[model samples]
Target: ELLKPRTLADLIRILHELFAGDEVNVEEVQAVLEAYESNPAEWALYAKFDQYRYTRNLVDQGNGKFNLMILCWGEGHGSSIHDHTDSHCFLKLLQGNLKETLFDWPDKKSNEMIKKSERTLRENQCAYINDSIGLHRVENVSHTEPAVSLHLYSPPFDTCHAFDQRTGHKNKVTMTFHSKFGIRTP
Candidate 1:
């Protein structure tokens, strides 16, 4: 059968097979991400916003192999510079715009992080980064409109360290979900 997943469950099934192999690669997941056109097509526009934080619209919590979610951003919403704590992360911008800034750790053993580069992702664009990278942050660039992006993390994590790029401060923080079963109750 062709590997075309039209919905979250469909995507999960394909990913289960992909992750069950002797090896799983980000490129394979990225290709599938690029192929699903109508997947979560309207979420960017339909979501109600919370002024304080971005919304992580859960898609699936894979069978301990991976986790998928749609991260929704309102104006000025963003993440603090942080590493994924060894989780391999894949993100695809589905709607609006996002500014992704990549950082570099001046010393691998130190908490000091330096800004390396920045890029804007428009609709249908995909990007991949892992914990090995120093640190990175994503922001919603819109003034009025909201942004939505799909994220897939293999061997999903429960906690990660957030770094202060200026003071070199770092601390491990617990992760939280914004929704469950399509309900925004988190």
Candidate 2:
């Protein structure tokens, strides 16, 4: 029988099992995420939001192989175009609408990046990305509603580069969690 996770905690437990190996199977991870039904009540405690930007709340700090987080995006919130450095990132939309825009790697000389594709992910949709796939920008596409997405990063990274879409100027940023283990950060 296929294991079906019934809550956020259950899902995290399954993810831990999936990442226990030296390498994770992408399709397996995707399948788990696709099969999960969004249960806002179970995650409502960690669904904190920020008016100025999206909030990343840590849900599980995996066994040094991966980590899980819930990102809460207030209305009009979005992320800068950024690249995942040497890690696999899987994003699952838990609530509201999110728009993802993919871009090509910046040109060496001028640092110009070309837009590749764009798509809107609704509730229960999941997306997988890595540096090799190129850079991306995710934004809450709602003017009046907030959005929440669950992200799992393998071989967890602490820093990444955020690129300016117009000038292509890139700035390295350290990722921080708004809350850890359901506690708000100071």
Candidate 3:
């Protein structure tokens, strides 16, 4: 996939050389997933969608890190405002467009989840998300066409701090932590 250096082999090689299989290696895998954005071709991102459908696919390897799985969804499909205890992350875009918005940790403010930073990444572009300070959200920006990416996390991206972005109103999603079905209540 153009989103991921054109081949997983390349990423594996880089991972082995630098991390020798460590928590940070999982971090690199997440970045590799984001790299797919650089390609944005339907064929490319679809290749690995199934692998990262949910927590079921996120298999634990050893120590705190786990073998990561990432699924690329099109525009309108993205993630909630969540944060892990500790993890460095990245993504590779596969087939579409994305507007990733990062926010600083919430503070006692006017109920406003102020966005710390935001950027739009197209095909083949890469993003590094080291939540050293806080957390954020990501989603497909295109009104048409689907996008894809992968994610790797240490401790397997669970037990996270999730937030309700829809005002102070409480809401619950049926399936995945982000949403159950792709259809949103519009």
Candidate 4:
């Protein structure tokens, strides 16, 4: 069993060790994630927020094996239903409440999507999803408070497709970081 991470640095170090081998042990990773108690002050440097949308702040690039990021959600902010570009996505709620809505893959010809499930994640809760599982949209469930979540993406992706709920038409989007290594990006 791994020791619970006491700091953001410890978390990153443990993750790096977890991904060091040829293949990652998902359950092991999940255990570490679930055990971690997020300290707001530990990640405050990367907690930049924006009014328009959730902000993605890079914590570690993971040497091409994965990408670790901290996402800050303003009140009522959310993301469009999007795929992970075949990557493994694990999210750990850091603060506030976040509602995750899952959808089935859009029909190839009809471009139709069906809602599958929805759930709320409270602080310190962890969730996992991938393309095979389907697409998802995450939003701050609290109207008065902002939310923060930490995400780990295995085999990091540079782009993903966001789907239109009504038409199911997807638009490819290139991902960008609002901040990297505690520094804001232009």
Candidate 5:
């Protein structure tokens, strides 16, 4: 896979500028859409990640305090049913279509993880997640197109709550895979 982060510093600058428009609790996740429009090379980052199913760490200052990671996924790729547990999340899709499957307490029948448990994200779309929302899994809908997303969390995102689908067991685990989804695999 081609890793085209030619101007790492410049790309980092652009990525930093992307979240400058949002606040600590802004509900609009798509606010960072303009960030990817700044240049072709910036888009190349997504393309490169897509080819390799890689995730680029724009910044990870605190071990688990605050962190920013970029992910690129291809067809038939997805994440485990998991959650940030104590943190909140913001995802801005820069390219292709990504699907997020979410879960909630059994009491919340209207939460819509059944019919809409799987939501597709195309270009310029964004989503948010936190402990209140429970667990979720995100994946690319098609193999023909690649999906790109940037994630941000306060403090950092090291340990997360992951649930097993077969046994209905949940436990806290440190994130593993650094690129698109699975942390344990890494």
Candidate 6:
């Protein structure tokens, strides 16, 4: 992944710079994510294989501002079409493949969404989706093996809004965490 790649600690330091002054810059976070993505080998080990469902491990929830997680996806598993509310999302695909679809809300006050774009992400690739980029859904897109990824969210994700594509309904939901500090349960 690198000549001498950076590690998880390296990412921690970059995140500090992103919010050091009690302010968050979208461009800065995006750039820092690029650096993190370039070193896939550094983050790959954090992606643990799970059998039943997608698994997530908390890496850090920093100073009430930034949060980091390692997500391992079982075959054909993924997230709902979700909105991050106030937080911005940075995703890095570490060890497997993923597919991401971005959605557009024609009316911010309503739940209606139009499919905007879709892309496939493989090892060492990354994506940044902020308020301007709109709602998204991510999936493992694998049939046999598990996939692992890294996610960084600003201001953390206490509550998120999930959208139903079929019925155009939006519901606020609390977050669920599977692990912390590599423990299977947290």
For each candidate, the alpha-carbon lDDT, in order, equals 0.78, 0.90, 0.52, 0.91, 0.57, 0.76
Stretch of 10 with least lDDT, candidate 1 = 39-48
Clash pairs, candidate 2, are none
Where model 6 places Cα greater than 4 Å from the true spot, the runs are 1-5, 37-46, 106-113
For each candidate, give its TM-score against the true structure.
0.87, 0.96, 0.63, 0.96, 0.66, 0.84
Count of clashing residue pairs in every prediction:
0, 0, 28, 0, 9, 0
Give the clashing residue pairs of candidate 5, or none: 55-179, 64-156, 65-155, 65-156, 66-155, 66-156, 113-117, 176-183, 177-183
lDDT string for model 5 (1-186, tens) is: 112223434434434444454334344323443234323355453343434444453433423345666666767667767778577677767667788877763332333233226677767566777778767788886868767776777646667766666554666777744433223223
* Residue 165 of model 3, lDDT score: 61
lDDT of candidate 1 over 1-186, digit per residue (tens): 338777656767888888886467778888887776645544543354567888776677777788888887988899888889888899988778899999874464655567889999888787888977768999996788778888888888879888887766788898777775577663
Task: Please identify which of the two predictions, 2 or 5, would achieve the higher TM-score against the true structure.
Answer: 2
Model 3 over residues 109-170: C-alpha lDDT tens digits?
43667677888877656666666866767777666766755555544455556566644222
Q: Write the per-residue lDDT of candidate 2 for residues 8-108, one digit (tens) a residue.
A: 78888898898888977998898898789999999998999876999999988887888889999999899989988889999999999999999988876
Model 6 C-alpha lDDT versus the unseen true structure: 0.76
Ranking by lDDT: 4, 2, 1, 6, 5, 3
Which scores higher on lDDT, 1 or 4? 4
Query: Where's the lowest-lDDT run of ten residues in candidate 4?
Result: 104-113
Task: Identify the superior model by lDDT, candidate 4 or candidate 6.
Answer: 4
Clashes of 6: 0
